[PDB]
């Protein structure tokens, strides 16, 4: 019965979609320790977002599942009888889920505490982490997109999925011949606009491109939008996430009866301040609840921000150098053999990262018996589930198969690299698996990945729903 399972995974791995590719495939039973299958298990490969598994376990060991993140507004002293302050500071401490609403409610607290004129300048303080925005070997041409957002301690998160350091751009058509309407979203009055886009005839071709040219803070739009087209939206990153958070915070202050008379910029609390007055503050949800949008949708910003938060807890340094050692140590203290690991970031966007399929499975076994095991496995995408917040990146995969609603696994796809790793819980034993593909030269081999997980689910004692 175990001899036939091997013949089918051998046959699945023959597919022409794996032409010139190296693939690590390892399957293990969690109750016994029986290695049911092993192919190139100790070979070093790139993981893409499967590197988030390692990060997320280390964030729970170091910071704990009870951990939350704070944000504050500070002045040198309280406001007077006239209700005047000088300079104000908005100070961030690594919150990956700070919304525009959250800023509005802090701007109400500021007015409630007796302020009605900010006499000086307003400063944004992100000095809880270093000001290294991107990783060394990330590619400059990817910088306009939400997954390559710059890293900061003061960052504003968009929408219910909490995409940091970005703004939503909207393009609406007018009459044929007239320029199209571009909205910059939150970054209105912060980022610059370069609108070169026109409206085309009804039924003409959509040729619209939205860019942020490298080393600028400009949204550049070109092409035609047909008069009969549904309007277009796109998330785009900005330069200095903290300066935007600043810009968005004085708008909130102004909307709330507090007047800012000076300028807005970056800067930290002067230190010659002996007793700063805290006029407003906010507290995030706990890390266990934050792990859900993070792991279900594969958030890169969250992972890089959590690394730098590990550097603070272990060393007092908000840095990739220090946090990456913290990840490595915490993984060891849990029992993982980290001989084959090369750690260059938390998200897995770096092509400097290397894992092995034996290492991922080792992690999945150790995380299975850790005190925080249920909050860990809840964050992982479930196969074939409609609900975005239950299915995540596996929402439209393995539906109508024996794996629907059963297989819990993390994904990770890039040019030349793709991976699926997680749990197959069932009555015939709870399984752990890792599939890692490198070197393929077409579409990512997602159906080969699906095919194995489905076959393992039938082996674990499941059937396709009807
Ligand atoms: C998970 C995240 N995207 C990525 O990691 C996509 C990485 C693309 C890198 C690109 N230079 C390439 O090589 O194709 C996202 O879609 O949010
Ligand atoms: Mg604005
Ligand atoms: Mg089932």
Please report, for residues 91, 297, 334, 377, 380, the alpha-carbon distance to residue 371 in angstroms, rounded to integers and kept in the order given.
33, 24, 11, 12, 17
**Backbone φ, ψ for residue 62 (5° rounding):** -85, -50
Please report, for residues 137, 367, 437, 438, 448, the alpha-carbon distance to residue 441 in angstroms, rounded to integers and kept in the order given.
22, 34, 11, 9, 15
Q: Which residues touch 222 (CB under 8 Å, ≥6 apart)?
A: 196, 197, 208, 209, 211
Nearest residue (CA) to ligand 1, atom 17: 147
3-state SS track over 384-411: CCCCHHHHHHHCCCCCCCCCCCCCEEEE
Can you tell me whether residue 45 is helix, strand or coil?
strand
- Cα–Cα nearest to 350, from 47, 138, 118: 138
Cβ atoms of 420 and 49 closer than 8 Å: no
3-state SS track over 307-339: HHHHHHHHHCCCCHHHHHHHHHHHHHHHCCCCC
Where does 160-251 show beta strands of DSSP type E?
163-164, 166-172, 181-183, 192-195, 198-200, 209-211, 218-222, 224-226, 232-237
CB atoms within 10 A of CB 133: 16
Where does 76-186 show beta strands of DSSP type E?
84-85, 88-92, 117-118, 122-125, 157-158, 163-164, 166-172, 181-183
| Active site residues per annotation | 49, 52, 298
Task: Give the number of whichever ligand sits closest to the CA of residue 238.
Answer: 2
- Cα–Cα nearest to 150, from 167, 133, 135, 166: 133
Probe target for ligand 1 pocket from 349, 352, 393, 440, with the most ligand atoms within 8 Å of CB: 349
CA–centroid distance, 195 to ligand 1, in Å, is 27
**How far is it, in rounded angstroms, from Cα 142 to Cα 147?**
8
Alpha helix (H) residue ranges in 152-264: 241-255
Distance, CA of 214 to chain centre:
22
CA dihedral 189, 192, 197, 199 (to 10 degrees): 0
Q: Please report the atom of ligand 1 found closest to the CA of residue 48.
A: 5
**How far is it, in rounded angstroms, from Cα 137 to Cα 135?**
6
Q: Please report the atom of ligand 1 found closest to the CA of residue 412.
A: 1
Please report, for residues 323, 392, 462, the alpha-carbon distance to residue 382 in angstroms, rounded to integers and kept in the order given.
29, 7, 15
**How far is it, in rounded angstroms, from Cα 360 to Cα 419?**
11
Q: Which residues are annotated as a binding site for substrate?
A: 410
Nearest residue (CA) to ligand 1, atom 8: 414
Nearest residue (CA) to ligand 1, atom 5: 349
Q: Which residues touch 233 (CB under 8 Å, ≥6 apart)?
A: 168, 169, 170, 171
**The domain over range 1-68+285-466 is classified in CATH as 3.40.710.10:** yes
Residues with CB under 6 A from ligand 1: 48-49, 139, 142, 147, 298, 300, 349, 414-415
- Cα–Cα nearest to 203, from 178, 179, 173: 173
- Cα–Cα nearest to 357, from 288, 284, 437: 437
Domain-by-domain residue ranges, the chain? 1-68+285-466, 69-129+241-284, 130-240
- Cα–Cα nearest to 437, from 408, 411, 457: 411
At 239, list the tokens.
């330069």
**How far is it, in rounded angstroms, from Cα 83 to Cα 418?**
58
Task: Give the number of whichever ligand sits closest to the CA of residue 246.
Answer: 2
Total residues found in the chain within this entry: 466
Can you tell me whether residue 1 is helix, strand or coil?
coil
- Cα–Cα nearest to 37, from 70, 2, 65: 2
CA–centroid distance, 282 to ligand 3, in Å, is 42
Cβ atoms of 346 and 303 closer than 8 Å: yes
Can you tell me whether residue 120 is helix, strand or coil?
coil
Nearest residue (CA) to ligand 1, atom 16: 147
At 98, list the tokens.
């700070």
Question: Please, what's the largest Cα pairwise distance for the chain?
Answer: 84
69-129+241-284: CATH topology is 3.50.80
Distance, CA of 456 to chain centre:
29
For residue 299, what is the DSSP state?
A: -
Probe target for ligand 1 pocket from 47, 142, 301, 395, with the most ligand atoms within 8 Å of CB: 142
């Amino acid at each position: 019965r175990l001899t036939e399972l091997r013949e089918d995974i051998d046959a699945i791995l023959e597919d022409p979609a794996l032409e010139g590719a190296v693939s690590g495939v390892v399957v293990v039973d969690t109750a016994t320790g029986e290695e049911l299958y092993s192919r190139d298990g100790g070979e070093q490969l790139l993981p893409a977002s499967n590197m988030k598994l390692f990060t997320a376990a280390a964030a729970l060991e170091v910071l704990g599942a009870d951990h939350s993140f704070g944000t504050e507004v500070a002045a040198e002293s309280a406001p007077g009888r006239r209700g005047e302050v000088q300079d104000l500071y908005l100070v961030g401490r690594g919150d990956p889920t700070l919304s525009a609403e959250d800023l509005d409610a802090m701007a109400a607290e500021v007015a409630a505490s007796g302020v009605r004129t900010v006499r000086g300048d307003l400063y944004a303080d992100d000095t809880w982490f270093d000001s290294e925005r991107l990783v060394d070997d990330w590619w400059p041409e990817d910088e306009p997109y939400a997954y390559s957002a710059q890293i900061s301690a003061l960052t504003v998160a968009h929408g219910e999925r909490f995409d940091t350091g970005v703004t939503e751009v909207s393009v609406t058509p007018a009459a044929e011949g007239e320029p199209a309407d571009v909205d910059l979203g939150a970054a209105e009055g912060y980022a610059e606009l370069d609108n070169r886009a026109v409206t085309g005839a009804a039924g003409s071709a959509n040729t619209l491109v939205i860019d942020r040219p490298v080393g600028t803070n400009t949204i550049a739009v070109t092409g035609s939008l047909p008069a009969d087209a549904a309007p277009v939206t796109a998330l785009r990153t900005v330069d200095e996430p903290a300066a935007l958070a600043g810009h968005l915070f004085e708008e909130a202050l102004e909307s709330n009866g507090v007047t800012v008379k000076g300028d807005v910029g970056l800067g930290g609390v002067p230190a010659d301040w002996q007793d700063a007055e805290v006029l407003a503050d906010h507290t995030s949800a706990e890390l266990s609840e934050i792990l859900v949008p993070f792991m279900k949708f594969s958030n890169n910003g969250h992972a890089e921000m959590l690394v730098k938060s590990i550097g603070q807890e272990t060393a007092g340094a908000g840095t990739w150098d220090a946090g990456l050692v913290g990840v490595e140590e915490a993984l060891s203290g849990l029992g993982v053999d980290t001989a084959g690991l090369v750690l260059n970031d938390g998200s897995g966007l770096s092509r400097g990262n290397l894992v092995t399929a034996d290492t991922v499975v080792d992690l999945l076994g150790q995380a299975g018996s850790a005190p925080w095991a249920q909050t860990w496995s809840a964050s992982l995408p479930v196969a074939g589930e409609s609900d975005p917040f239950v299915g995540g990146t596996l929402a439209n995969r393995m539906r109508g198969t024996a794996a629907e609603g059963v297989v819990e696994a993390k994904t990770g796809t890039m040019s030349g690299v793709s991976a699926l790793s997680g749990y197959v819980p069932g009555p015939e034993g709870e399984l752990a698996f890792s599939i890692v593909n490198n070197g393929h030269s077409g579409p990512a081999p997602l159906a080969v990945q699906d095919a194995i997980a489905v076959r393992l689910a039938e082996y674990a004692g499941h059937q396709a729903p009807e």
